[PDB]
Design a binder for this molecule. Structure first.
Ligand SMILES: [Ca+2]
Ligand SMILES: [Ca+2]
Ligand SMILES: [Zn+2]
Ligand SMILES: [Zn+2]
Ligand SMILES: [Zn+2]
Ligand SMILES: [Zn+2]
Lengths: 526, 526
């Protein structure tokens, strides 16, 4: 049994990103794991304080770091959406994982593509070193699959809707995929009675009102054919893992001479967290199912005799809805002023700049990147920068605003990510040609979803604060020596850590991360 | 069974401080608790990210916050030792828990006293409101017992050495105490074979060299009569808990009309952490024994039918020795330059100020408070401040140095403790008449114990960084509703939280902490 994680190159790397699986949520339920998460935390190399270190704590930037060893300042994936005011097409909003150069495309109707990603992934690097490498990537969300797989992946599949898993335009379903989609279709057509509460979820079972919604007691009961219900539930993760297992077996991943790699993006935790917040029965059930399904997944790989190493992490952390925080000893938790949402803020700034009724800024939400309209004249732009800063810095819920020049002037951060300044975090997701003219950051404990009568999502991530940056990073291979390392590491450290195990050279000057030693005690895998 | 923590006033408050039980160490072993810590974490109000929020993360300042609702800036307990250069006696170094006005006293031979503590404790406040209140405080260290009990406590006992538990000068052992000390004497006179490793400790069993010492594989085997061995082991915590249980029963605490309070300072985790670091078999065994002994302690109270509420926390966090960190993926971990220790630094600064061979500064260690010698003339003092700052700020291991005026100019901090600036942390343990003229803070991951041939302690706390500030805070009462709140709270919040349960008014302007709601969901104990 006892065997060093670096004894020989693993034959399969399994990289799992659990979307919105924050270190807080991970740590809370840690004492109840009995399945796959138990395996990882009791036997693996455990870094409970990993960091998606940059400020833009969203899915695309986060997934772009996991298998690239690169911060969003290098991957170019600085948000889920960014503005290119010089874009040919009408819609200046660009989706992180689209090819906007395609005719008749818009951010609402896009063609999936890894074109925006500026660097190779680990799979891309492995394939460059050895053409026989298979690189597979499956996920619940296109952006997760696409950013982990990279431009040279062999198979990139994601959940497209009620039809099941799909890929890039032109890519026909393989027999495995049609079989998976048949099973998915059969599961979807059946009602789901829901889940009774795990023992640990009983305490979380109370209703919380937020606008017209009540959350906190959901059990994922759903009607037949309810695709939205299926998506926002543990069912989609179970299906994604079954798909991954089927692909692993069908392609004989890890059964050939070279090392293969499969990346797996489990999206459910994130839909659940947005829809219900993170401390109710919904997230609790979801994490317990995650533990159980991961256990079954690992058991199947074991039974197949595959020599695999697993890394499991998240694309970012998350934060509970203010309404429940206020019931659980956090009375200062609040929702962002509606005055800071795109329409309102532009109108306000216009009127302050003396350009009332005009369009002087573009923004995507009540925080993050803000862009000055290109039409503005030099003097107009100057009045906009002055007035925007003056108004924002005076707002009670605003922590700070950085100018583009201030961020650019900041050196790429180094040292412990848990103690970075806000501008260092900003610099880590700064890419001059895509980033805003200003960066707006809200105070801690301000949720960037305004209070509304009719609400959709009640909770979100995307802030520069610790809840949203901190994520677990867990490495495991059969027989290795467990250790726990509570000091801060970055998700950009993942690539060089894995590369060391398979003796794949990676030029240090092409990445941001550093190699994490995965061998407890004297010997060093780096 | 089901019953709100605020349904009625508890009859007994049990406050437990586990010395150096950092949130990191607490979180690491959380999945293995089966005893008293399991009870607290699965059934209680769990705040896994509590903060000893100030910069001076030492035992005395930490214990001074737990039952006072007050930061060290208000308690006046700003360190374990501070200089009073105007003191009458020769030794200008004052111990936090002594009365230096006593003749022939020195910091090496002092008379224990709570005189330095500027504010009442919860016990003191309860007794002020109701004279029938019993206030008891027992600990492994005098400073823990003294600071949690306060000046009006009925019984304050601490481990004095091979003779067992002692109190203030003049206080005779009671029959209970002589009985406890008899049992302790019997335990001490027996060899201890040591402990075999709990399953979770097996992975930690490898040797680590630090100077002339090897740590990482200890099992607490000890010879008969080895008091040092007894002190640096789980044995002392077992004895302290048995003493507490015996006192509770003997005095019928919680069995009368009024609420009584007992504070318990379990010191072993801290001795073990200093002596061996925090990630080896020694700390692992110690935490497992802690869990088991706490379980037996709570079971005895339950069997006695006592209506008690428990709060459990730590006086500060802690940090592993650099030598093991470097083996476990933290290669940048290092020991502080010897040049920064008291003797050396003074000599250096003297020579830079043009007062070579003189005594221009006083300091206690390679970080923290520095004091200018009173003998210095205005101009001399000015050259010292200039040269000290210049030299320190240039040193590669120094994060920053604050002047006294800079800290004084800082308002008492508010808002989330996890995101305070360093000067805010400094302000939180700043007390003008006791604090230094300068405050020296080392960079993250610099251990403030220099590398030496012959070493004693290999690891310590006392830094302004997150490992040393972050501590668990756990509240429990039979039948309450469990909840977990991962956002940052302060240990100064403990007093008003407990006071709310027993309907004891506490003027907000006399404390720094705020009341934490301990009732999950809609109802609020505050
Ligand atoms: Ca409540
Ligand atoms: Ca090693
Ligand atoms: Zn995400
Ligand atoms: Zn999300
Ligand atoms: Zn201590
Ligand atoms: Zn200590």
């Amino acid at each position: 049994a006892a065997r060093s994680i670096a004894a020989t190159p693993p034959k399969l790397i399994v990289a799992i990103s659990v979307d919105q699986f924050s270190a807080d949520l991970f740590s809370e339920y840690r004492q109840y794991y009995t399945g796959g998460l138990k395996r990882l935390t009791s036997e693996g190399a455990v870094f409970p304080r990993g960091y998606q270190s940059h400020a833009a704590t969203e899915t695309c930037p986060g997934h772009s770091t996991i298998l690239t060893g690169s911060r969003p300042s290098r991957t170019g994936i600085i948000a889920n959406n960014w503005f290119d005011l010089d874009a040919k097409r009408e819609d200046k909003n660009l989706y992180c994982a689209e090819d906007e150069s395609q005719p008749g495309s818009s951010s609402d109707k896009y063609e999936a593509s890894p074109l925006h990603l500026k660097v190779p992934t680990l799979g891309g690097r492995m394939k460059a070193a050895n053409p026989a490498t298979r690189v597979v990537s499956v996920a619940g969300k296109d952006r997760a699959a696409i950013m982990m797989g990279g431009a040279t992946a062999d198979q990139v599949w994601w959940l497209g809707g009620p039809q099941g898993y799909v890929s890039y335009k032109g890519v026909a379903p393989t027999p495995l995929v049609t079989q998976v989609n048949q099973a998915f279709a059969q599961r979807l057509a059946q009602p789901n009675p829901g889940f009774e509460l795990p023992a640990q979820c009983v305490s979380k079972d109370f209703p919380v009102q937020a606008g017209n919604r009540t959350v906190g007691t959901g059990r994922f009961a759903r009607d037949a054919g309810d695709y939205k219900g299926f998506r926002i539930s543990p069912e989609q993760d179970a299906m994604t893992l079954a798909f991954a297992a089927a692909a692993i077996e069908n392609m004989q991943l890890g059964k050939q001479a070279q090392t293969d790699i499969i990346s797996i993006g489990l999206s459910a935790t994130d839909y659940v967290g947005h829809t219900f917040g993170t401390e109710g029965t919904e997230s609790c059930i979801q994490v317990d199912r995650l533990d159980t399904e991961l256990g079954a997944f690992f058991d199947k790989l074991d039974k197949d005799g595959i020599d695999y190493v697993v890394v499991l992490t998240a694309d970012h952390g998350g934060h509970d809805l203010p309404e429940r925080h206020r019931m659980n000893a956090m009375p200062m938790e609040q929702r962002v002023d509606m005055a800071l949402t795109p329409k309102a803020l532009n109108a306000t700034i216009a009127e302050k700049a003396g350009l009332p009724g005009k369009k002087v800024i573009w923004s995507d939400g009540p925080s993050g990147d803000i862009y000055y309209d290109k039409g503005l004249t030099a003097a107009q732009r100057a009045r906009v920068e002055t007035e925007a800063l003056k108004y924002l810095r005076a707002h009670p819920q605003v922590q700070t605003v950085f100018t583009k020049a201030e961020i650019a002037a900041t050196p790429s951060p180094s040292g412990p990510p848990e103690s970075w300044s806000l501008i260092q975090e900003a610099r880590a997701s700064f890419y001059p040609s895509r980033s805003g003219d200003l960066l707006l950051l809200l105070k801690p404990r301000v949720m960037s979803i305004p209070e509304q009568a009719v609400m959709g999502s009640v909770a979100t991530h995307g802030s520069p604060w610790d809840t949203d940056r901190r994520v677990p990073i867990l490495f495991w291979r059969k027989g290795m020596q467990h250790f726990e390392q509570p000091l801060g590491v970055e998700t950009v450290d993942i690539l060089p850590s894995l590369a060391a195990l398979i003796k794949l050279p990676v030029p240090k000057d092409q990445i941001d991360g550093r190699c994490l030693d995965l061998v407890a005690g004297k010997d060093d895998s780096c």
